[PDB]
Amino acid sequence: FSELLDLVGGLGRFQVLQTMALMVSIMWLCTQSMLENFSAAVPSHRCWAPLLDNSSLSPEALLAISIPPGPPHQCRRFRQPQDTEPCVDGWVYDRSIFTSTIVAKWNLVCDSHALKPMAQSIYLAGILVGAAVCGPASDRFGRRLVLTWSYLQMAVSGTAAAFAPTFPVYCLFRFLLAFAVAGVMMNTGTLLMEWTSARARPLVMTLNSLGFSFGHGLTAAVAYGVRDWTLLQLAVSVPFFLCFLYSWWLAESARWLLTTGRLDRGLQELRRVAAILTPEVLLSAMASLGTLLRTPGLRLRTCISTLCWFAFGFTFFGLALDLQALGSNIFLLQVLIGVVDIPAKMGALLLLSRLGRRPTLAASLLLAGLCILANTLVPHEMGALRSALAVLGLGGVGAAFTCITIYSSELFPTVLRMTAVGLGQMAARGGAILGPLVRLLGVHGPWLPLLVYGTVPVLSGLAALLLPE
Ligand SMILES: CCc1oc2ccccc2c1C(=O)c1cc(Br)c(O)c(Br)c1
C-alpha cells in the first residue's frame, strides 16, 4: 500500500492540513480531560456558622469562636459560640479563585470527599470502555465515521455534564464523554498513521503528543478566562460541534477501505487525497493476544512494556488530574505542564536516536519518578521548588510516554506489533483508572499518594532496563 501512498504523495498539503485539524481536535480533547482540576477544584470551605452568616466582633474573632481549629477545621463547628458538631447547615466556600465548582455545588467535601477522585476515575473508566468498544467499531465501521460520531458524542455529553443537575448525572455524562474521547483518540491516531508514509510515523506520533502538550496550555487559558464550572465545561465541549461538522472533510482511511473490500470507495478517497491510477492498479496492489502471550520469548518484553504503559497512565493521570497538591498556582502549573512537555518530548525524540532507546526510556521514567519523590520530600513552604519539581516530573512522564510509544513497536515482530501496542494502551488506561483512586490514601497523609506516584514510575523505569535494545 505504501506504493499507493507514494503515488498520491504520502506527505504533503493534505497530510499537513489533516494533521493540523486533528491536532486542534486533540488539543480540545486534552482540555476536556484536564478540565477536571479547574471545574472540580476544591475551594477553601468551612461549616456554615450562624454567627458568621447571620440568620461588635471582628470577622477573625467570629471565625475563631465559631469554627474549631483544624490541621480552621473545614467540616466542624462549635455547637455554641465560644461541643463541636458537623456542618449541620452546610458549607461556605471560598470563591475568590473559582466562582463555582462541582465540589462547591454537590458538597463533595469530607464525608463525601472520595466522590471527587471517584468521579474522575469514572471518567477514566469510560475511556477504557470506549477503547474496548470503539476499537472494533473502527475496524467494522469507517474510522472517520467513528471519529465523527465520537466528536458528536463528546460535544453532547460535555454540554449535558455542564448542565448536570445532580452528581450521578454528572458522573454518567462524564463517563459518556470519556467513552467518546477514547474513540476520538484512537481514530485520530489510526487516521494519522494510515495516511502518512511509514518513514514519518514517529514524526506524526510526536505531533500527536504535542497536541496534548498544547492542550495543557489551552486548558489553562480557557480556565483563566472562565471561572464557572458550568460555563467552563460548556466552552470546552462546544468546539466539538465544529469538530463533528468539519470531520466530514477528513479523508477516510484508504487502507481500511481497500482491505475491507471497498475498492471503488477507497479509489475515490485516494484520488481525492492525491488531488489535494485505475481500479486495476489498486486491485493488483491490494495476531491475537493469545499468540503474543503464549510465545515464551516475548513474556519478559511483553510484561515490561505493559508495565511501562501502566506506569505512564497511572502516574500521569494521578498527578496531572490533581495539580493543587503539586503546587500553589493551578493555572501556572497547568501552563507549565505543556511548556515543559514540549521541550521534554522533543528531547526524548532526540535522545531516542543518539543516546539509545532503552536508556532514554529508563532515564525518563527514573527522572520522572525521582522528581515526584523529591517533590513530596522537600518542605511544603518551599513552594516554588515543589512546583518546579512537579512540572519536571510531569515532563519526564510525558517524555517516557513518547519513548514507550516509539519503542514498544520495535520490541515485537511486525505481526504481534499491533497486539502489543493495544495491550500497552489498555494497560495505560487501566493505570489511569487507578490513578485518581490512590488519592484516597491522602487521608493517611498527603505524602502517600505522591509516594505511590513516584515509586510506580521509578520501578517501571528500573524494569525497563531489562528490555532487549
Ligand atoms: C500524550 C499522553 C497524554 O497526554 C494527555 C493530556 C490530557 C488527556 C489525555 C493525555 C494523554 C493520553 O491519555 C494518551 C494515552 C495513549 Br495509550 C496514547 O496513545 C496517546 Br497519543 C495519548
Residue numbers in the entry: 3 to 57, 66 to 81, 85 to 95, 112 to 305, 315 to 324, 335 to 517
List sentences quoted exactly from the publication behind this structure:
The reabsorption process of urate in the kidney by the urate transporter URAT1 plays a pivotal role in controlling serum urate levels. URAT1 (SLC22A12) is a member of the SLC22 major facilitator superfamily transporters. The cryo-EM structures show that hURAT1 has the common architecture of SLC22 family transporters, which is formed by the N-terminal domain (NTD) with an extracellular protrusion and the C-terminal domain (CTD). Structural comparison between different conformations of hURAT1 reveals the rocker-switch-like mechanism for urate transport.
Benzbromarone is a high-affinity hURAT1 inhibitor, which was clinically used for the treatment of gout. We determined the structure of hURAT1 in complex with benzbromarone to a resolution of 3.0 Å. In the presence of benzbromarone, the structure exhibits an inward-facing conformation, in which the extracellular vestibule is sealed and the intracellular vestibule is open. Benzbromarone binds at the urate-binding site. The ethyl-benzofuran group of benzbromarone is surrounded by C32, S35, M36, F241, and H245 of the NTD, and F360, F364, and F365 of the CTD. The dibromo-hydroxyphenyl group of benzbromarone forms hydrophobic interactions with F449. Moreover, the side chains of Q473 and N237 form polar interactions with the hydroxyl group and bromine atom of benzbromarone, respectively. In contrast, the N237A, F360T, and F364Y mutants maintained urate uptake activity similar to hURAT1WT, but all reduced the potency of benzbromarone to varying degrees. Notably, F360T had the most pronounced effect, highlighting the critical role of F360 in benzbromarone’s potency. Specifically, benzbromarone clashes with the side chain of F449 of the CTD, and verinurad clashes with R447 of the CTD of hURAT1 in the outward-facing conformation.
